[PDB]
Amino acid sequence: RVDVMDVMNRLILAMDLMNRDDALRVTGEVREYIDTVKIGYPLVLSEGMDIIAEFRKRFGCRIIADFKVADIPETNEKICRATFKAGADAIIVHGFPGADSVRACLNVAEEMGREVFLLTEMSHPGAEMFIQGAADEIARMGVDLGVKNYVGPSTRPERLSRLREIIGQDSFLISPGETLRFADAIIVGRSIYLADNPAAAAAGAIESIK
Amino acid sequence: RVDVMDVMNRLILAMDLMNRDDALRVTGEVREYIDTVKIGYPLVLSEGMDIIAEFRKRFGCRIIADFKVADIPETNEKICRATFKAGADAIIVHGFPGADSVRACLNVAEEMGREVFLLTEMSHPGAEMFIQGAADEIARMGVDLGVKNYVGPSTRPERLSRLREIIGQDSFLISPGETLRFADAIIVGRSIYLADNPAAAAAGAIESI
Numbered sequence: 083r084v085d086v087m088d089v090m091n092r093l094i095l096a097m098d099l100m101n102r103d104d105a106l107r108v109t110g111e112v113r114e115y116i117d118t119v120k121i122g123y124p125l126v127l128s129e130g131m132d133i134i135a136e137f138r139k140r141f142g143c144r145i146i147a148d149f150k151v152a153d154i155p156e157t158n159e160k161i162c163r164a165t166f167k168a169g170a171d172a173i174i175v176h177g178f179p180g181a182d183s184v185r186a187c188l189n190v191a192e193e194m195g196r197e198v199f200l201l202t203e204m205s206h207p208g209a210e211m212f213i214q215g216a217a218d219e220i221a222r223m224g225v226d227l228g229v230k231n232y233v234g235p236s237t238r239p240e241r242l243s244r245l246r247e248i249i250g251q252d253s254f255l256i257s258p259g260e261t262l263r264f265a266d267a268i269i270v271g272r273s274i275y276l277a278d279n280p281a282a283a284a285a286g287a288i289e290s291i292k
Numbered sequence: 293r294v295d296v297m298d299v300m301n302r303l304i305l306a307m308d309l310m311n312r313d314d315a316l317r318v319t320g321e322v323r324e325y326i327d328t329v330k331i332g333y334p335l336v337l338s339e340g341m342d343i344i345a346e347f348r349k350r351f352g353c354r355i356i357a358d359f360k361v362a363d364i365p366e367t368n369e370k371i372c373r374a375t376f377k378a379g380a381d382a383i384i385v386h387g388f389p390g391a392d393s394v395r396a397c398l399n400v401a402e403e404m405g406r407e408v409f410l411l412t413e414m415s416h417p418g419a420e421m422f423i424q425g426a427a428d429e430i431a432r433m434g435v436d437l438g439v440k441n442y443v444g445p446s447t448r449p450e451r452l453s454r455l456r457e458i459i460g461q462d463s464f465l466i467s468p469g470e471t472l473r474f475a476d477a478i479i480v481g482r483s484i485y486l487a488d489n490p491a492a493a494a495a496g497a498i499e500s501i
Contacts, residue, residue: 100370122363124370127378131337152362152386153332154416160310160334168337176362178388180418206364208390211433212426223421 086230086254087144087172087197089267090117091288094146094256096271097121097137102129106140108275113141115284120174120269122148131168144171150201152176155186162190162198172197174233177220178213184227197231199256200224202245205236217241221248230254234265262291296440296464297354297382297407299477300327301498304356304466306481307331307347312339316350318485323351325494330384330479332358341378354381360411362386365396372400372408382407384443387430388423394437407441409466410434412455415446427451431458440464444475472501 095116099105105125119137126133126147134145147170151158158175165173175187177200184200191198202224203209203217217235224232225248232249234257235241242257242264249255257265270287277283305326309315315335329347336343336357344355357380361368368385375383385397387410394410401408412434413419413427427445434442435458442459444467445451452467452474459465467475480497487493 098367100374122367123359124367124374126337127341127371127374130340149333150362152360154414155418157308157332157334161337164310164334164337178422179414180416180421180423182416182418184418204364204389206390206392208365208392208394211390212388212422212430213390216422220422 083252083254083266086252086266087118089144089256091115092262092267092291093118093284093288094267094269095119095274095284096148096269097275098124098271099275100124100128102133105129105133106136108280109137109141111279111281112274112284113143115281115288116143118144118146118267120146120148131164135169138169145169146172146174146199148174150174150176151183151187152179153183154179155182158183158186159190162187163194166190166194166196170196172199172231174199174201176201177223178216181223181227184223184229188227188229198229199231199233200229201233203235203241205258218244218248221245225249225253231256233257239264259290293462293464293476296462296476297328299354299466301325302472302477302501303328303494303498304477304479305329305484305494306358306468306479307485308334308481309485310334310338312343315339315343316346318490319347319351319353321491322484322494323353325491325498326353328354328356328477330356330358341374345379348379355379356382356384356409358384360384360386361393361397362389363393364389365392368393368396369400372397373404376400376404376406380406382409382441384409384411386411387433388426391433391437394433394439398437398439408439409441409443410439411443413445413451415448415468428454428458431455435459435463441466443467449474469500
């Protein structure tokens with residue numbers, strides 16, 4: 083789809099290493115295969131938000147800030163603004179705090195020409211308690227607000243089909259084979275960044291992608 | 293209660309300013325009145341996590357990191373570890389992602405001798421959609437996990453009494469007069485940091501306390 087982001091090879095690197103040297107080292111090796119990297123709080127809190135601009139300049143990659151934004155609207159707006167100012171192309175935002183909290187993020191993204199990803203569900207065991215039961219309604223909330231980018235559940239193929247049904251065929255969906263029948267790109271972390279040679283691990287994972 | 297934190301004057305400063313100069317300027321001027329300061333992501337993302345150690349050294353204050361931690365367990369562990377390593381005395385964690393995500397935080401806090409606050413509910417309009425309906429169960433989850441520190445709803449007195457009922461009389465509860473009948477300390481932000489005389493605004497808030 084022309085109006086949503088193009089992810090090279092449909093593969094997003096989850097760069098979850100927490101020290102700057104390792105993160106830049108392991109990543110550098112793969113920029114030929116990947117142009118989109120997801121970074122989270124452990125790295126940025128440990129090394130500083132300046133690491134975002136460093137990735138983009140050293141690798142020319144798109145950065146998604148996996149910050150799972152989950153505050154009140156005013157604070158969400160400030161988190162998004164600081165994150166985009168640091169150069170993030172996109173930010174991942176929880177839906178469970180409701181529509182106004184999401185809209186605050188969308189407002190800043192529109193102003194700054196950046197993107198918001200709505201996190202509709204999570205896959206860890208604790209997610210059954212409250213998140214699983216809210217997932218469909220959160221996805222619908224996103225659609226109703228004009229959200230165009232979604233992050234779906236790691237596992238359960240049939241959950242992706244359901245999410246894809248709710249959000250429509252045009253919106254952008256990312257998830258951790260069968261998966262790419264519903265998601266537009268897959269997120270891969272450990273398989274690559276803890277590999278003996280990430281360069282080859284990336285290349286192999288990409289071969290698997292049709 | 294001896295086994296939970298003593299907050300000076302029962303008043304926590306929500307230092308929500310985003311630039312280091314302003315944040316430090318306003319805070320120093322109230323340290324006589326406040327010994328506990330809550331800081332969030334806008335400041336730390338803008339200025340660096342080193343600002344936490346700066347607050348503690350310049351003012352001798354306790355720092356609560358209002359990071360609303362809301363990830364999977366392994367990532368929560370790492371967020372907490374980085375935040376405590378930077379010097380935070382406590383961290384505020386969401387309960388909606390479930391028990392294992394909260395436990396991950398509790399594990400690191402116990403290891404490092406720090407504290408976890410469970411956020412049981414939020415007060416912004418959107419909180420009605422999913423958070424309000426989960427609040428009692430989240431509070432009970434905390435109790436069942438041995439959580440001793442809670443953050444409650446800004447508004448609605450009767451919500452605080454309900455929370456206090458669930459968590460028991462000994463756990464520590466903070467919230468944004470009637471409030472201190474149920475909460476152990478109140479969180480105050482704009483009233484103070486957007487005041488022409490923060491020193492005076494703090495002093496008045498403390499007098500009314």
